[PDB]
């Protein structure tokens, strides 16, 4: 009989409060399917492949072919719309400056890699590597892997160099240290914490990124 978790009585008393004296900057991963392969099926070729008599017999079934083809075409257009909605949320393709001074934070593992022929980040390369004709045709996506990589790179550059501002309108530059100070103010922790523990936070963030790299590289589940 499976256990639901370790029993843990909270030491509750009407005048006892536990306050945290430290923190960890945990980088977790969440994978979301966005689109499915665009496939179109030729009704006549599949059902009556190269047969005039079969095609004539199939003609009597009314508008089955048109409705099946319309359904598949709608699904394919839906896939294109899904990708466009998810990724094309940035009006202008921002790019990070050549000088990488982000307050000690190290984004080299997620910023685009010029070395690879495709401008794709290191962790993006890991993700791509880990994931793997009878009237059925597999249409290609409108946005190639290169274009989706460009969109994600634009999103990352905008985020890093401008905080949340680029989502509201014109992207406003801002030091990433001050951006993180604002992020801390958002969660109810004063900003002086970030300034006073900037090096510690940067080290924790870099270690978390490394752990993400290792987890993606090792476990494919």
């Amino acid at each position: 009989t499976m256990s639901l978790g370790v029993e843990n009585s909270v030491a509750y008393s009407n005048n006892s409060i536990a306050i945290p004296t430290n923190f960890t900057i945990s980088v977790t991963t969440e994978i979301l399917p966005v689109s499915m392969t665009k496939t179109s099926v030729d009704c006549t070729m599949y059902i009556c492949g190269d047969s005039t008599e079969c095609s004539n017999l199939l003609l009597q079934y009314g508008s089955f072919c048109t409705q099946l083809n319309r359904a598949l075409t709608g699904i394919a257009v839906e896939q294109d719309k899904n990708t466009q909605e998810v990724f094309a949320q940035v009006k202008q393709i921002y790019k990070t400056p050549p000088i990488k001074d982000f307050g000690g934070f190290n984004f080299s593992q997620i910023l685009p890699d010029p070395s690879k022929p495709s401008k794709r980040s290191f962790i993006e390369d890991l993700l791509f590597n880990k994931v793997t004709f009878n009237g059925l045709t597999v249409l290609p996506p409108l946005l190639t892997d290169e274009m989706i990589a460009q969109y994600t790179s634009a999103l990352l550059a905008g985020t890093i160099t401008s905080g949340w501002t680029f989502g509201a309108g014109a992207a406003l530059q801002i030091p990433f240290a001050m951006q993180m100070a604002y992020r801390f103010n958002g969660i109810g922790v004063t900003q002086n914490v970030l300034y006073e523990n900037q090096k510690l936070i940067a080290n924790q963030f870099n270690s978390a990124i490394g752990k993400i790299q290792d987890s993606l590289s090792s476990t494919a589940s």
């Binding site: 009597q60 079934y61 009314g62 508008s63 989502g167 509201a168 030091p175 300034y195 006073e196």
Partner: protein
């Protein structure tokens, strides 16, 4: 712009048309009209073709009902989204980003439409950006000062503490800033006078 609604209409209409057109198909029967088959063949002979006609029309009905269920699920998802926006964009102010339109959300107004709703999202979009030199904190008496609400900016020579979403510079006074620790820890911290309102009052 109204395509989202118009499209929907067409889809439904299209389906009905298709359904009706399926009444004019043989499905393998001698004719597409039950009355003609009944009048031209005896029941023992007619039933053979009527079976094909019935099976075809029933299959068409099942296809129509299945696709209608799928489309109704899609419309139910969109209606749940519309109810969420009515609750959060209209009946309140949504802090969620891009949920109630691009830019900071001020308010929203509902407007009916044929088999749909239309939200006029009034949002606030900053327009004219100006560069400034910024520092995370400020040192006055060795104590690092951080802004309570706002950010330290400089037009080149003087330091002001301005709210983040609208450039409204203000003198840097102890009311605007709070101290935490000394100035040997922060990176990018700077030196500047932090005006104290109480000093002139005590002087006089």
């Amino acid at each position: 712009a109204l395509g989202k609604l118009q499209d929907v209409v067409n889809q439904n209409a299209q389906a009905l048309n298709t359904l009706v057109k399926q009444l004019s198909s043989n499905f393998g029967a001698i004719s597409s009209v039950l009355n003609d088959i009944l009048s031209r063949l005896d029941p023992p002979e007619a039933e053979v073709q009527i079976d094909r006609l019935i099976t075809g029309r029933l299959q068409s009905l099942q296809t129509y009902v299945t696709q209608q269920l799928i489309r109704a699920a899609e419309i139910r998802a969109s209606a749940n989204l519309a109810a969420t926006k009515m609750s959060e964009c209209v009946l309140g102010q949504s802090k969620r980003v891009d949920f109630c339109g691009k830019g900071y959300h001020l308010m929203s107004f509902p407007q009916s439409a044929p088999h749909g709703v239309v939200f006029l999202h009034v949002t606030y979009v900053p327009a004219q950006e100006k560069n400034f030199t910024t520092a995370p904190a400020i040192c006055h008496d060795g104590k690092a000062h951080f802004p309570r609400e706002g950010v330290f900016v400089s037009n080149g020579t003087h330091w002001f503490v301005t709210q983040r979403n609208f450039y409204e510079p203000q003198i840097i006074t102890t009311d605007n800033t709070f101290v935490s620790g000394n100035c040997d820890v922060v990176i990018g911290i700077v030196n500047n006078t932090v005006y104290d309102p109480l000093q002139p009052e005590l002087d006089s």
